[PDB]
Subunit: 243 residues, 2 copies
Amino acid sequence: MSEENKIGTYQFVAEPFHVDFNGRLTMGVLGNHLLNCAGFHASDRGFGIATLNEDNYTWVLSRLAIELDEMPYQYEKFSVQTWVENVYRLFTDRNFAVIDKDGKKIGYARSVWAMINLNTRKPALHGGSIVDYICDEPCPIEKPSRIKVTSNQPVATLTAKYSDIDINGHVNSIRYIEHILDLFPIELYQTKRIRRFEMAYVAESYFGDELSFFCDEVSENEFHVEVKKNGSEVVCRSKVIFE
Amino acid sequence: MSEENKIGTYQFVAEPFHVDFNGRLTMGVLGNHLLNCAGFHASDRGFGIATLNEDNYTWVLSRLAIELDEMPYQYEKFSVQTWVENVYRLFTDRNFAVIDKDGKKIGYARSVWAMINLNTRKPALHGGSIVDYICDEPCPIEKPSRIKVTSNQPVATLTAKYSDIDINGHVNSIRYIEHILDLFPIELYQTKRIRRFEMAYVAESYFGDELSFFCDEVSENEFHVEVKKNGSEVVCRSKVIFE
Ligand SMILES: [Ca+2]
Ligand SMILES: [Ca+2]
Ligand SMILES: [Cl-]
Ligand SMILES: [Cl-]
Ligand SMILES: [Cl-]
Ligand SMILES: [Cl-]
Ligand SMILES: [Cl-]
Ligand SMILES: [Cl-]
């Protein structure tokens, strides 16, 4: 199997309820597409959640970094390519390219997934098919790493609601993205765009939990965000770079 | 052209970030699919927003009623059929059927759209193609009509945020659905399901507006909701029937 053959490619159109006030695809919706594509790619090749679950493992998303030159516009076609870059002992690195209507690469993403035993919730091989799909396609963006947040004064608070919760009873990955991006003043979105966005998923939140949001502005364009539940426990961290 | 030939049919899969804690497609996501399907159907046949806009008209959604026996489950295929039932002088009635993975009709929807002149914002014929697609397919649910809400004590308040706003700078149709459905206690969603849901879109809200929510519980299972902006102006009304 060729290197090109290990890549999954998926076609989309930017719908009106999935774009912002500038008509560009929202980060939350892009994240949704990336994670669904990861799932299509894994499931079609027999190394997705369903297969893992039969042997008492599952996949958990640990880190996501998205870097963009531009975002698709309302009603434009776009596509996502995804592939497995590495399968390490404790984590798998899955990468993405986003392709605009003209076939130009307009962004990239890197995701880091843990495999955990479902009985013990403990972390984490080759009887499977995943190793066969390790692919050398380039993804020329910096790997996501630990995010530091110094502030201990919350800037906003929000209770987890029915619309936030997925089938496992927790606040879903994408809903955290939406809430974080709602922290920023509209003048920022009017004058700049997000060029890099990172999520670190630390712990779970449930319906009724009070989420508090803390933010360090490290430069004019770089913000580090920490979300905590019920005061003290970090549930996720984020880095947002505007330009 | 046969009656069957005037129907558009669109295929979907219920994605994980589009279902609730019981694994069923959310109302907001279903609404999103219905409205997008309406758009696919109109645009493909030359009576959509794009065509209207060339002559200084547009379509505005006035009313939506959805009635369901069940909702698709996570990862199931489903489909939406849509067709034009009537083209009246001031409004067009567009209807929908929702079809489950087995081909069983599991719900219906009715939508009412106004055509308005874009210069004058005034309301509202045959040089177009729409009349050619009037279709007698059955949609055996009650038409939506005016919703009465008596309560003048708000039960909740929310500021319109970046994630709420569409390309025209207003709070989008689907975001109102999500916020309304977040008013109800989780015990209701644990023990009952929404069998009928109606929206009436009265006026627009913008970024930063304070939305207040008023609710009459007319019986154990029927709720009427009014959303107002900045205290006084009604922006939408809703009816939610659980069973
Ligand atoms: Ca989840
Ligand atoms: Ca709109
Ligand atoms: Cl989209
Ligand atoms: Cl699988
Ligand atoms: Cl981190
Ligand atoms: Cl869906
Ligand atoms: Cl059109
Ligand atoms: Cl009404």
